[PDB]
Design a protein around this ligand. Sequence first.
Ligand SMILES: Nc1ncnc2c1ncn2[C@@H]1O[C@H](COP(=O)(O)OP(=O)(O)O)[C@@H](O)[C@H]1O
Lengths: 223, 751
Amino acid sequence: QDLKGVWSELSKVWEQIDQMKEQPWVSVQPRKLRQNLDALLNQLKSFPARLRQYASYEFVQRLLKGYMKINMLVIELKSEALKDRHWKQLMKRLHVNWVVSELTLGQIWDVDLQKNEAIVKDVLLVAQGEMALEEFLKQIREVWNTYELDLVNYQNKCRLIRGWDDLFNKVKEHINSVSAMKLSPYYKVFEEDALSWEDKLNRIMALFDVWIDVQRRWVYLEG
Amino acid sequence: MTRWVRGIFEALRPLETLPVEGLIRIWAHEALRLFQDRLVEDEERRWTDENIDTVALKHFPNIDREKAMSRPILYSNWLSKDYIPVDQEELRDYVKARLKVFYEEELDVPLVLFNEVLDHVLRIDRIFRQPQGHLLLIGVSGAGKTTLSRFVAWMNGLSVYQIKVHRKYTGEDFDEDLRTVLRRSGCKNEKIAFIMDESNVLDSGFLERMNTLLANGEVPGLFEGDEYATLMTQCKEGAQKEGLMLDSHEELYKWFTSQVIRNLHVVFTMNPSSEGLKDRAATSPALFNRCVLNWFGDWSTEALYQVGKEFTSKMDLEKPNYIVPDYMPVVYDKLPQPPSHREAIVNSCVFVHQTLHQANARLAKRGGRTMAITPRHYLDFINHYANLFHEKRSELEEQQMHLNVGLRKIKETVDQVEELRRDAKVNRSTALLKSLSAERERWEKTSETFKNQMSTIAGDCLLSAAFIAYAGYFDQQMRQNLFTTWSHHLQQANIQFRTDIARTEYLSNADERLRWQASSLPADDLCTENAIMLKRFNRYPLIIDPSGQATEFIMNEYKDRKITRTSFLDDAFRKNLESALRFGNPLLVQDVESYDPVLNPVLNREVRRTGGRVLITLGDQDIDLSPSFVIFLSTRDPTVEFPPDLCSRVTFVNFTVTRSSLQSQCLNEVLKAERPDVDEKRSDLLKLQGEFQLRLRQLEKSLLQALNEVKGRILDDDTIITTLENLKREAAEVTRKVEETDIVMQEVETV
Ligand SMILES: Nc1ncnc2c1ncn2[C@@H]1O[C@H](COP(=O)(O)OP(=O)(O)O)[C@@H](O)[C@H]1O
C-alpha cells in the first residue's frame, strides 16, 4: 500500500544518509557534502504529497534541514583551526569519547551541533586566536632566520654594515608585539617559546645597539 | 545625469511590462536618490521634493500623480526581486526580522528602526550593490552611520574591515593595513566594506593613497619588492580558482586590480564640518567625485520619540490615575490624544532633548563655548532614566517590605503583651500598649508617605537622569535654568514630582558626601553636583578644572583601588592602559587636548562577550577587560575645543568658576559665617529630603533588632519603652520640621 511504499522510500533515504555518513571527517568535503545534501533534499521533495504527509518523512526532512543549517558549523570545524587540542576541549566539554583517526561525520552529527552552537563557536574563536598567535610566531621565525646583514665594502679595507634604521625598527616592533603578547587569555599556550624569542630579541637588540656605536667610533677614528 | 540614466536603465533592465506611472516612479526615485540625498538642511529637501513632483506633472500631463509619485517612494530588491518598489511597512517587517537575526550573530545592542534608518539602509544597500560603489556618509556622531554601514554590509555578505588608528601611527602601518585589505579583497575574492572614521583621516599622508585607490582602483607603490612577488604568487592561485589561467605579470596585476574594483567598497564616516569638508575637497577631490555622499544629521522628533518609546518598555510608567492636562506641552505632533502616561513621559524626554538644543544654540548666539549634542546623549539620558527608575523603585519597595515586616512584628508583640496581661506592672503594660498603638498609626502615616513617594518617583527620576546625562558642561546658572525649564514643562504635563527636589540628596547619601568631603573636595553646590556626575555615569567622565582639585579628589577616592596617573604625552600611556585592562585598577588621564584615538574602543565600550570572556579590541590586540575597570579623562584649560567624536563619547564635568558659581559660594559663606541659625535651618530643610527619614529608618531597624528579643527579659521593668519614646521624639521632631517647611523656606529665601 501507500504506507509500504513510503516505508520503502524512507528505508532508501536512510540507507543513502548512512552511506554518506560513513565518510570520515577528514575526507568529508563541506562543499560536496552540501551539494549531496541538497540533492537528497530535492529527491525527498520529489515524493508525492500523500507520501510527504507522513510523520517519518517530516522527521527525516527536518533532520536534513538541520544538517544543512549546521553545514556552516561543519565548514568552520573542518579547517586548520581545531588541530587536536581544541578537539580535545570539545570532547571534554561534550563528554563524548571519539577516535581522531576513526572520526566520521556520523559521530559529530549524532551530537547536536545546533544545541551546542555556543560551545562550538567558543572553541572556534579560541582556535582562531590560537592560529593567529601561532602564525605570528612563525612569521617571526621566518623573518629572523632568513634575515641577513647588509654588508658593504669600505674603501677595499673591510666590510661594514648598513640598514641600522630598518633593523632597529624591526627589532622594536617585534619586541613590542612579543611583550604585548603576554596579555590576552590565549597567551597561556606556547608561553615558553614566546619567552625564548623575547630573550633572543633582547639579546640582538643590545648587541646591535652596541654594534652601531662601535662601528661609528671605529669609522671616525679610522678616518 | 549619467548616474541618473544608468540607474533608470538598471531599474528597467529586468522589467518587461511597465506602465508610464511606473516609469515616472522610477524617475522620481532616482532623482530623489541623486539630488535630494546630498542635501543638508530641511528647506532644500522640501524644495527638491516639491519641484520633482512639479516637473513630473508639468512635463507629463494626463497621468495619475498618486501612483506616479506617491509620498513614501522606496525601491528595494530584497522583497521579491527585480528591484520592484516595496511598501514601507512590509520592508520594515523584513528589516526587523533581519535585524533580530543580526542581533543573534553580532552586535546584540538594540537598534530601533524608524523611517530615517529605514531609508538609510536602502540607500547604503543600493550603493554597495554596485561595482566600485564607494560611499561617503556625513552625519553627526551617534546618528547611526557605522552601525547601519555594518548592518547593510552583513546583510549583503560584505565583510567589514576597519583599521585601528592611534598616536604615532606612521604611514608604514597604514601601508601594511592597505596591503592586507587589498590582498583579502582581490586575491581571495572576498568582498570587503572598508569603513573609516575621521580620526584616522586627519593625517594628510593617508589621503593621497586613499584618493588613488578610490580613483584608479589600485594604488601603485603599495606593492613592491618581495611583497609584490608574494602578491603575484597568490594572484596566480586566485586566477586558478576562477579558471582564468594567465601567466604574464602585468595581465595578472590587471586581473587583481579588476578584482579589487569589483570587491572593495570604501565607506568614509565623517562629522559635519563645513571648513573641514572644504579642506577635504581641497586635498582629495575624488571624495566628491568617486564617492557618492549621503547626509543624515540629528534624529528628527519622530526618531527621538520612537527611540524613547522602545527603550522605556521595561519601565512601568503606567499610572491609571493619570489625569490628562488641557493644553499639553507637545513636541511630537503625532502624539496620541489623549496620551497615556508612558506617551507623556516620552514626549517630555523629547522636549528635554530639544530644549537642550535650544539652550546650546542660545549660548552659541551669546558668544560662549558650546559642545556638540548628539543622539548618543539621548541614549545615555534614557539609560540613566531606566537605571534611576529601577534603583529608586527597588529602594522604595524594599523599604515598604521592611515596614510591613515591622508592622507584623508589632502586631505579634502587641498580641503577646495582651496574652501576658491575660495572666504597677499592669499600668506599665497599658502604657506599653498605648505607645505601641500610637507608633503603629505613625507607621501607617509612613506607609502613606511611601505611597506619595512612589507617585512622584517617575518625575523625580526623569529630572535627575536628565541632569546627570545632559548637563555637566554648563555653569551653575545654566544648569539651574535647564532644571527650571524641565520642571515647568513637567508641571504643565501633570507629571507628579516634588516641587522642591534637591538634586544632590536625591542622588546620594550622607555617607557618600562625608567620604567626598574627607578627600579634597570643597563643600560647593557645583562641586557636589560634579561629584554626583563622577559617581553615576555610563560614558566615562571627562573632567575640566583649572585648579586641579578634581584630579586630587578622584586620586584620593580611588587610592584604595591603586589608581594610576598617566598622561597622553607620555609614551608609556598605552602600556599603562594595558595594565588597567589586565588588573582592573582605575586609570586617571590628563592632557586630553592631545587626544589619543586608541582610547576609542575603551570609550565606545566595544565589548565582545563570548565563552565566559569579555574582550576589548585595543588596536589589533584583544585584551581581557577586567569587570571593575574605569577611566577618567582630565584637563586643565577651560578654553579648549573638542572634536564631536570625543564630545559624544564622554560625560562632561565642568569645575570652572563663573559669575554664578562664585556668587553662590560667597552667599553660602556669608550665610554660614554671619547667620549660623539661618544656615542651620537651610541645612535642615535641604537634608529633609530623606536623610532624616533615613536616620529614622536606621533607628527603627535597631528598635526591631532590640524588640526581636521579647520574652520576659524585655520586661526588666516592664518598660523597654525608652527606645520607642526616643523614636517618638525624633519622629515628632521631623514631623514638626515637615509641617513648618514653608515658613523656614521663606525665611531662608528672605535672608
Ligand atoms: N536606529 C537606532 N536605534 C537605536 N540605537 C541606535 C540606532 N542607530 C544608532 N544607535 C546607537 O547609536 C550608536 C551609533 O554610533 P555610530 O553612529 O557608530 O558612531 P559613529 O558614526 O561616530 O561611528 C550605536 O552605539 C547604537 O547603539
